[PDB]
Amino acid sequence: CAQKFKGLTVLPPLLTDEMIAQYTSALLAGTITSGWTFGAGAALQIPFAMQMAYRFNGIGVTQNVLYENQKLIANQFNSAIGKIQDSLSSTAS
């Protein structure tokens, strides 16, 4: 089975596929609920809208733009996320 014999084996990896998923989930939760403060020390909570406003402010656009177009930005993000599933589900991998 799987060729085998003749002294050719395959060693299983140290980290299973569950530990990696746990790590990625922890990273996602930290990024969502802390922003970038958890990468330099203790995680500090902050509302998501304020974090996005500060990320807008970091690229040269004043923070009132998000506070005026929050609904449009959320809808655009949701549609963009939805399109990724269709893009990946196609046979053209």
Partner: protein, 50 residues
Amino acid sequence: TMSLGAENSVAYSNNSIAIPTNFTISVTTEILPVSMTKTSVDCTMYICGD
């Protein structure tokens, strides 16, 4: 079975924020190789000497 780390939970809320009130200065090291040993081989003597 190896342990990934300590469990934690962030107290997320609609209107809540945390601001630090003190700081700590940390100093850490880091080691990086640069060069190795230079060697030369005398092939004629090594293949067969004398």
